[PDB]
């Protein structure tokens, strides 16, 4: 019977390919082409945040659009004031092998985790001035590659187990588990309506996850290798992805097709992080050559370069009001660019 | 009057920075070791005699060593291995002679060695269970590695007096298969430190201390290299 199922899968793959080819009446490059270019985009470092003793694995902007949380190998999370450069908090971790972190949208708590296979939630609104773990989420068996917060006490996590899950931080329980990837899940990005989530993985694919249903609505392909970072286009119907094949791709969720690719002959560096500016016109990407590039998202050209890191770029983030770009790296310094 | 908040923030920053400076002093004095290796290599006997990541703490000559042991994210393994590039050393455990476990160990070794993010990390190599090899050999390498048929020990070999010559050539053959990988690349940016062992004592295991001493000395000398 196995042979029949194999044949059905191949027939369905072709039905999908034809359904997608049917929509190929344009490329983004034939739609945008007469649009004025962004021109040269330049940025300067305005602030440098010093204090980590080791490489930064993760960084995240809060919603007040002023605070940053960053995580590093030496065992600490640091909560920074992006305007004054002062440290607000420094949080010791039980295990130093931290790969990810996230700041709650309410500003009340911080998540982190890594090779310990535990997502630990810290309560910042502490009566003692002592930031303590309020809860630990465990049930994952692989490393935690990414976690993102939802309101109503929920967190979305992804791991090296090839799965993703929705947790209730009241009980320490999973309510929903998302499956279907074959490789490690490398990243999560929440839709603006936080009902759809997108999951990137080491099988060169990305999936659009229906949060309330607990199922995959749509699978996107196009990359040659592992996807390291995904971010949603601000207006909800497209996501940009970056991978180890040293290119970025723009995906169209309504057409179910890649829409545009971003590449250059002189880039053989993997992409470690991607993010969008508020208009969705500037696509930022961090690379293995310790540069970050700024792409013209509609024309696929290079608008500019952010140089000034002495090691691998590990993470990008753009504050919600669009005022600044923060870049974390393996050289242990977190810089704010404007 | 907002100046009162500015004063409070500065004092909070001062307490935090003082604690970070104390931790920096501890961090630099603590060595980090990764325990990595082939399946059924005896990783457990190296750690016994010497939920994710397990950690064992050791002290030798007032220096502190933390070793990260074995389990969790164990097999996949290309994305988490990068977390361990900032270590003093990787301790790679391979048992000396089913599947061709030694060829697998050799491929795993090369995958450390030529990885662009592990290019500066030295490897302490333990060829374990030398007693297993001795019994299998005197009673097996050439079935998987035909080159062994023509192998002789080097003039620099130091066999245990009374040890069977077929075993001594087997031990050195295996060691050399790992070394020929190490000698092919880096140009001296990283080093391999092979040892022959068994689950018998800590005299050879304590060589981790001595290898760390050599690894750190080599790093310190980089600041004094000339243009």
């Amino acid at each position, epitope marked *: 019977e196995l042979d029949q199922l194999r044949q059905e899968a191949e027939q369905l793959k072709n039905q999908i390919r034809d359904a997608r080819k049917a929509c190929a009446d344009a490329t983004l490059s034939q739609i945008t082409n007469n649009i004025d270019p962004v021109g040269r985009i330049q940025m300067r470092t305005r602030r440098t945040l010093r204090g980590h003793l080791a490489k930064i694995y993760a960084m995240h902007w809060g919603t007040d659009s002023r605070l940053l949380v960053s995580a590093s190998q030496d065992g600490k999370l640091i909560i920074w004031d992006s305007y004054t450069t002062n440290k607000v908090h420094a949080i010791p971790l039980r295990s130093s092998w931290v790969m990810t972190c996230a700041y709650a949208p309410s500003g009340n708590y911080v998540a982190c985790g890594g090779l310990d296979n535990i997502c630990s939630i810290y309560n910042l609104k502490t009566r003692e001035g002592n930031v303590r773990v309020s809860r630990e989420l465990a049930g994952h068996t692989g490393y935690l590659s990414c976690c993102r917060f939802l309101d109503d006490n929920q967190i979305v996590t992804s791991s090296g187990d090839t799965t993703c899950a929705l947790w209730d931080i009241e009980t320490g329980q999973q309510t929903t588990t998302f499956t279907g990837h074959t490789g490690d899940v490398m990243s999560l990005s929440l839709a603006p309506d936080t009902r759809l989530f997108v999951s990137g993985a080491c099988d060169a694919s990305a999936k659009l996850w229906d949060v309330r249903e607990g199922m995959c609505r749509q699978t996107f392909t196009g990359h040659e290798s592992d996807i390291n970072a995904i971010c949603f286009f601000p207006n909800g119907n497209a996501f940009a992805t970056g991978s180890d094949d040293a290119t970025c791709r723009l995906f169209d969720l309504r057409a179910d097709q890649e829409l545009m690719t971003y590449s250059h002959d002189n880039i053989i560096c993997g992409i470690t992080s991607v993010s969008f500016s508020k208009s969705g016109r500037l696509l930022l990407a961090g690379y293995d050559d310790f540069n970050c590039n700024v792409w013209d998202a509609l024309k696929a050209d290079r608008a500019g370069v952010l140089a000034g890191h002495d090691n691998r770029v590990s993470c990008l983030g753009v504050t919600d009001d669009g005022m600044a770009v923060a870049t974390g790296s393996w050289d242990s310094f977190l810089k704010i660019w404007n | 009057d907002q100046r009162n908040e500015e004063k409070a923030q500065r004092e909070a920053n001062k307490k935090i920075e003082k604690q970070l400076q104390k931790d920096k002093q501890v961090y630099r004095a603590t060595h980090r070791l990764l325990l990595l290796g082939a399946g059924e290599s005896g990783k457990n006997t190296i750690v016994k005699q010497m939920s994710g990541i397990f950690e064992t703490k050791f002290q030798v000559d007032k220096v502190n060593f933390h070793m990260f042991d074995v389990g969790a994210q164990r097999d996949e*393994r290309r994305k988490w291995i990068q977390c361990f590039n900032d270590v003093t050393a990787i301790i790679f455990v391979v048992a000396s002679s089913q599947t061709n476990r030694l060829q697998a160990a050799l491929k795993l070794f090369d995958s450390i060695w030529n990885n662009k993010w592990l290019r500066d990390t030295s490897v302490i190599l333990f060829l374990n269970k030398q007693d297993l090899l001795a019994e299998k050999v005197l009673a097996k390498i050439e079935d998987y590695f035909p*080159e062994f048929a023509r192998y002789t020990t080097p003039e620099d070999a130091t066999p245990e007096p009374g040890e069977d010559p077929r075993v001594t050539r087997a031990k050195y053959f295996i060691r050399d298969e790992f070394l020929r990988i190490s000698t092919a690349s880096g140009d001296g940016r990283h080093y391999c430190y092979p040892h022959f062992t068994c689950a018998v004592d800590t005299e050879n295991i304590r060589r981790v201390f001595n290898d760390c001493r050599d690894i750190i000395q080599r790093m310190h000398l980089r600041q004094y290299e000339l243009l």
Partner: nanobody, 126 residues
Framework: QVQLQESGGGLVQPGGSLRLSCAASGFTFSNYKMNWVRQAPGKGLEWVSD????????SYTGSVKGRFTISRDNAKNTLYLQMNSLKPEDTAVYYCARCPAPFTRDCFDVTSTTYAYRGQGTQVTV
């Protein structure tokens, strides 16, 4: 979607030979290394042969030296394994694994349970 499709397996008597190959699709690989991987009945997966993207062979497992050879043709996106005189021990499923990244020297883990499916595969019985 990246694809690697194997063909050319079947039954050969001891002392005979096979030519196995994979057609690659969905990618540019002139930038990538290729690996032949084998799974004997009752065993896990073992590495057999490794060719660089330049066309130069790098290595063979010792047990196949002088018996198996490999080659590639970047003009047609194909990978080949020539299996000369075979023994009963060579009965296995053959796979065309590829390395995870372009322009590199490291390559792992091409024999793992969930990686090594790339290029899955064909049965050769001696």
């Amino acid at each position: 979607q990246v694809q690697l499709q194997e063909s050319g397996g079947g039954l050969v008597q001891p002392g005979g030979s096979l030519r196995l190959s994979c057609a690659a699709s969905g990618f540019t690989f002139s930038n990538y290394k290729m690996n032949w991987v084998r799974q004997a009945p009752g065993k896990g997966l073992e590495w057999v042969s490794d060719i660089s993207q330049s066309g130069a062979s790098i290595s063979y497992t010792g047990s196949v030296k002088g018996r198996f050879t490999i080659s590639r043709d970047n003009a047609k996106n194909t990978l080949y394994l020539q299996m000369n005189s075979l023994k009963p021990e060579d009965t296995a499923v053959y796979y065309c694994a590829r390395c995870p990244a372009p322009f590199t020297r490291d390559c792992f883990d091409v024999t793992s349970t969930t990686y090594a499916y790339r290029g899955q595969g064909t049965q050769v019985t001696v």
